[PDB]
Amino acid sequence: TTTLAFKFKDGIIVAVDSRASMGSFISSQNVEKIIEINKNILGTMAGGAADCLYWEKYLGKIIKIYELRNNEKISVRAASTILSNILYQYCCGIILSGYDHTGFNMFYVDDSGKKVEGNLFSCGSGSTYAYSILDSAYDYNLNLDQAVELARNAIYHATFRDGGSGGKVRVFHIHKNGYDKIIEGEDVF
Amino acid sequence: TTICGLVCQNAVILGADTRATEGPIVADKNCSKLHYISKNIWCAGAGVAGDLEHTTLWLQHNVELHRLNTNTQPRVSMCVSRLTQELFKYVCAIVLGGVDVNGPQLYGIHPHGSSCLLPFTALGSGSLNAMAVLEAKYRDNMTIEEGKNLVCEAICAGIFNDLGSGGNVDICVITKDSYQHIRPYK
Amino acid sequence: GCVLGMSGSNCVAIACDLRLGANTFTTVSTKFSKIFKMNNNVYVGLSGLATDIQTLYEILRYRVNLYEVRQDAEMDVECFANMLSSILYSNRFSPYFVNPIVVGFKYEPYLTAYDLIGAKCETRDFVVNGVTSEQLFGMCESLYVKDQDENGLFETISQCLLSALDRDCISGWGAEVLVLTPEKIIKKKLK
Amino acid sequence: PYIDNGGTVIGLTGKDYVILAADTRLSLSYSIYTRFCPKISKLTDKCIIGSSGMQSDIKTLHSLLQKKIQLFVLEHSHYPDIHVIARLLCVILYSRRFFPYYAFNILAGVDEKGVLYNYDSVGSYCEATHSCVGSGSQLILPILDNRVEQKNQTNFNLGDDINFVKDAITSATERDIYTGDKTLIYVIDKMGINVNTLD
Amino acid sequence: TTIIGIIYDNGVMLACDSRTSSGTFISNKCSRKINRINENLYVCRSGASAHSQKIIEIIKHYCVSMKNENRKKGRFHEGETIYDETTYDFLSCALIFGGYDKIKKQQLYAVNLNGSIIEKHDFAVSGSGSIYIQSYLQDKYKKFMTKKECFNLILNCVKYAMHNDNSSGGLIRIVNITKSFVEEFTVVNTQ
Amino acid sequence: TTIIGIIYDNGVMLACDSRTSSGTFISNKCSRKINRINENLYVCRSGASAHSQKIIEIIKHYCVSMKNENRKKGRFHEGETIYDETTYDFLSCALIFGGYDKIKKQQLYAVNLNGSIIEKHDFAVSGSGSIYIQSYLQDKYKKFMTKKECFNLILNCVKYAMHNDNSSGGLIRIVNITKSFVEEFTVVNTQ
Amino acid sequence: DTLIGLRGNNFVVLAADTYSINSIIKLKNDDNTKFYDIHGNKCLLLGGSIGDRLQFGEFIRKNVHLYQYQNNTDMFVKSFAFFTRKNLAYYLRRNPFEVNCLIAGYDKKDGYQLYWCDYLSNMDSVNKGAHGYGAYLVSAILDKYYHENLTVDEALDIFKLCFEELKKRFLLTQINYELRIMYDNKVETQYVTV
Amino acid sequence: DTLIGLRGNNFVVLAADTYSINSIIKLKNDDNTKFYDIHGNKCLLLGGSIGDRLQFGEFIRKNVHLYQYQNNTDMFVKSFAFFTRKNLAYYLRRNPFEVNCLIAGYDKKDGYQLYWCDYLSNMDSVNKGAHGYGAYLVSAILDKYYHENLTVDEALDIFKLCFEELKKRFLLTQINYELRIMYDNKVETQYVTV
Amino acid sequence: VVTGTSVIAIKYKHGIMIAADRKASYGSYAKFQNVERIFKINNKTVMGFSGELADAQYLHELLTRKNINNLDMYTPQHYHSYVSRVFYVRKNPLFNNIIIAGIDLYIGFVDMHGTNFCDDYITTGYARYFALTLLRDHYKDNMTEEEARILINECLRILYFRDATSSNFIQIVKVTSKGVEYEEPYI
Amino acid sequence: SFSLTTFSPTGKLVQIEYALNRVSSSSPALGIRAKNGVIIATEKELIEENSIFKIQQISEHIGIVYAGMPGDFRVLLKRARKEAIRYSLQYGSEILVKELVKIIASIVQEFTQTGGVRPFGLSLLICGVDVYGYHLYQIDPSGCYFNWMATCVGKDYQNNMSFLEKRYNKDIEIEDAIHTAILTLKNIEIGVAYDNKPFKILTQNEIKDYLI
């Protein structure tokens, strides 16, 4: 697949290809890879669909009981670290995104259980391609107009250049509150 | 691929399936597993189609050319020597029925090149499924009409009973005087 | 690799994907064109590995031009096709894969499809070698009507393409569809 | 520990219904076992399920999930939503990923409009407008693509739709060797779940 | 499967059962494992059918080349040695040389996978079913037996070998290589 | 190597040759392949020596536990079945149960690599040298034989098996499990 | 290790890397000449192993210089690409050289031409292309910022993009990139290009 | 990927790389924190895979912070090295982590200390050491220009040597190298160090 | 490693035939020319195995020990489902193609994987090719005993000649309303 | 080796001219090309002559006659047939008669040039059929294959070369062409490729069928 995330001024944002092909054949393009956990944090799966879905739901549980336990919202580094601590036992890499600090933190947890913090992670097969656009076209923080065009753009080139990912676009700017939601079909013009 | 052929009271009668397959999906609704090596001798190969079209071409022309080069009708056993020698040099079974100075001879030819004269024969996936019905009802010196109905029966059984075999049938009565083909036995 | 060949009342149609992606299906190219013209009434659509495609169409270019000049008649499709089967069979190794499709009037339309060893199917109707072939036989088996005008047959073959390309990751952009009649040839690009 | 069989079970959500058809024929590598096998099971209520993997895993998996829906409904006095069913499936399946079930699987249900869950062997479940699995899937999906969806060019009358299913499968027997000539076809209109032995 | 041979009071008496089981499923039952390399000498064979049959034809035409190049019929020892040197050059078959020769009226050579020993005052047995009969037959052995008496030993030893060896065949053929002229024998079956 | 057993007019008569060839070199010649699991029943064994001997001791003490837990001597069928279920659980040996039982005065069980069949009106033979004698012995068979008469069959069949099987031993031991009381027999050798 | 080429009506420009790693773990040998000027107006950008691209590059160099010293006409660049095609493909699958190549050239009729080719003898005419592991990086840029009608120098800014991109996020590759620049009259190198 | 550490009477200084390659072909992730300050006066420089050095580094971090929150005394750095020794070695040969480490620290008796260790639990006290493929490069410099009595800053010039060396002739590694600098009072980072 | 190449079973309204030969080849060659592969779990139920022997007697003792506790009575269906459940437990194994059959009438097959099903006629092992299709050819419901047994005898006739490993003589069982009958006679 | 033929001062190859003289010195055969068929004939005691005809079947279509040395005809006919077969293996269809005439012409060429061999001693006629039409090509020893509506090859054909035209006047039908052939030719042999592609020699009884 193909997942993208980066933080401009107004928040962290999340973008993705909805295609989910089992081999050369396409099982589905309706598939949703973006998942919410805590009301403010969310993650994107990349790689295998079943294991990634499992670990996301599992994360939702552990986070949920924690959130019930302290009666509050946990910091994003926590939710990263739990997967870093469980995955190391064994899958598929993932990206996390959320708000605890005045800036939204971003993370990326490898199937190796490697954890990484940073500003513009991307993953999935086509990661490299948008991943060029992310500094050639985003060396620094910008605007929501600039950003939704940016992610829609970088996803489009990760859609054209990679046969392993495509389908619909689905960008999700995150407000300090929760998040927004946007979905698109083909946009070659 | 079933291929069943059987001797009658004066003529070999060959019959065969007509459906190529790539292994999973079928890759043809029809094919020719009853090649005509000569007017009074045919081959019915089973196996890889490629190797079959090859050696049957080379065989047909070795036999037609040799017939041009000599008086005698290319008596059936020479085809068997040529084919078996070719396969021996090295994947495709064959079943060949011809009629000549001897009897209506019929042969079966294994992928390693082994030859055997046979009263009745089958090869391919359907072979088992054809050996079942074929052997049960066989009798030497059947009326050729009995060949006409039987060989279609054993073919239909070796069709319905395999995933790898199916489609329309075709049958022919290789009389020494003449082949009598029909494109769809079904 | 993705190739089609519908047949018509007074026509034949041939089509393809135009992508020649590399390993992990990254699209290294989108203008690649497997269809070729060996003759005004004879076409071949190659598929499978692209190296073997250019080498093969190249050798046909050779031996067919050689025969047409050596013997004045434009080559009949049965000749080009049986000879083609003869060509691949000499060595499996030469094409690690290739799946030729041969098409054209002979003015009865002639549609045949070789296997990479030279196994061959001389069909009376459509045949569809290609990496996306299952989707092809799947759509075209039921969509097909015996005989049609070149445009309805065009939208037909186009619906088999438009359908198949969206199920396969390796299927290309575009469509080099190529309806033809003995006196005319109509290529088009569909998106 | 896995054998391939072609249960070619397909799902298809109508505007007020869901339709689940499957060839009945069982087969070894190239030989037919039974001419007639149940490749589809009925989940206890308003939903049903199909699969096409090896038959031991089909049967034991349907058994298990049936035991779970029956236990759940008896413990909670409440017939499960379709979602808890498919979700439970992701659960059961992933719980054994290190030694996976070979049964790729399909769910069809109604929420009260056929909510659906086709998916991979390890529970990577998805909803869909339509579904196919078994060796007959890759062939039929384009036929199902166009008849209903028109992404590059009224689609669910019950008659027209059962027709699309019919022609799709009947064509599928032709191009595929594993697909069998017989078919069951279920129809989960909100009243109840019809069965058809059309072939 | 089984191939056997015991010399009666004068000549050889060879035997075999036909089955030609193929892949642990019988394919060409009632074949002819025993052979006419010539009237003077017959050559039982077992192992792979293809390699054996080709080798059989090959030694045949060497035998005829030798047969007419010198008008005397070739000694069977030479048939043995040419089969020795031939199969030496992989190819694989095991086999039994019996026959009449004015030089040595009755012998019985036995070629292994590669190299060939004799048994002038003995018997030769080979194949999967051999192993049952090596011990049984080498008990009943006595050199005085006439064909009426040794026909029994051949017949029975075949029957026991066939009883408890799955590869071993049904109908059996035997040849009574008489010291004198013609030596013919007809197919027969028991159980 | 060889282990055999034929029931005479009443009781069993088991036999074996000792050699215990080790790595195709004889190591412990004149051992004792036949065993006393008990006076009522004796148990020939062949295969790997170690696995067999351990299994032998194990079934021994089950036999004695059963022997005293119920003062009647254990039926040999039960010795057979416990060896069945035991070796089922890799471990590997083949073996022969003979003995006397008031329930069934003479039987002869035969355990394969894993699962065990009987031969009430027959004989049991096993080992590398078995295969020579299956056919020879199953000819000479008749149920009427007394020990004076069947002692010969045992003796000879051992001698033939030992003749033409390299693993097969020299000195041989036999037991005449008489229907009545004691059944002893002494080591003996021929060739 | 990264190779890049870009055609337009005003230009063919072949940017490419200069490094040459003895050991894959380290770029011990530097400033290597990946290019091979094979024509008055056709350069060849080879890649992979240094020994394959050297043997093969010198080889093609000779067969073309021979062909031109022979017949009066210069080798038309598509004939050059296809000849390299036949040569690279000539090897049985057991033997082809591990050599990624960008033919680039000029024509008296067809003007500027570009041919992307592969270790396998796969080849196509394109408006831009890349080789090495870096193909994945620059291509989303080269696709993105491409003008079909662009002046050559803003393309040179596009290679500045590509390069600063490969530095930041790849096998870091900071040293200056030579790049022959086609013109109606001549090629025009820039070894200093950073 | 390259790790370096150097002890003297006036200093322990752990220079190290900041890159972190997702794919071995590319350093897609940057500025990583290889160091782990585990003590008031003992840093741990881990390397290899990011996930092993992270799990293990956090692990050792906790066992030491636990040990110190427990007994009054701080963990003496050799006890720290040996404890890391026992932990890394605890794994059966089937399981040890792929983790190269440089313990470095200060002592109330033994003053500055340094412990070079390996993926295999091999370990020794040394005056200088290195990890990664770059070990082969800087070590001939570190050996060469070393003063046993040197002031800390000329050592910092020695790491400038080592670094400009690894840039020129290795997996090019230009980005700034963080490096904790021991003092009698405290550690002293320099993320800006290029 | 003893193996039994084939078993078949067929039914008609007045009862259900089920037969096999008694050979038990110990690899390349026959060991037990008189093995008993058909086995009687219940007065209205039997199991017939065609694979490796030891596993078959194992499952034999298992099904019996499983039975005596329940000896309404254990139905052939419950016996079959217990059987398949055992194979599939073992799998995650035993080599057989055991079929359960008995009584209205019930035949069920089980492949080695615990794959299993139910049909009017079931054949097992080498028979499937060399008998089943033929027995698929002439099978009809309400065959009388003469029709049915002459039919299975035609099938075993084709089989002994085509199967590589068969015995000349057939242990045979028919289940009737009166009770299961294991015919002694062999052919 | 050595081309035994070499050029004259006068420019001619004398040897091939000799072979021309031998063909001229050898036995007659006719060819006539009906609008809907082609007929070729020739003037052919212990000897059972029934085995011996100058006529020969190269394919179901093509048939030939030589004039010169019979063994030379034998080997040319052999290579020729092996070429019709080599072609029908190389492609899926029957050889065009013109193509086979070209390959025979090259085979005849080589020996006329290639070292160490005596040039072929005979002319050839090659009636045939193709999708183009019913054909008749004579092949010269030089390699000079040539189209003919009719032809002659053997002794005393100077006067005899000019009887053949009359069938084209109004006898283009085969049955009337027969008289043109035999009466021009006035033992004997006749092979005819008719409206059907296959050709077959007329028996002496059918030779008496036209003798009346």
Ligand SMILES: */C(=C\S(C)(=O)=O)[C@H](Cc1c[nH]c2ccccc12)NC(=O)[C@H](CC(C)C)NC(=O)[C@H](Cc1c[nH]c2ccccc12)NC(=O)CN1CCOCC1
């Ligand atoms: C018998 C099947 S079987 C399992 O019983 O032996 C048939 C015999 C057959 C099929 N067609 C003809 C024509 C004339 C004579 C005999 C014929 N053979 C097969 O089913 C093949 C299966 C092999 C593995 C046993 N099928 C094939 O070989 C494929 C045929 C094919 C593929 N694409 C096509 C397009 C049009 C027409 C036919 C085809 N092709 C391959 O298997 C590819 N191979 C791979 C290795 O060998 C050479 C090419």
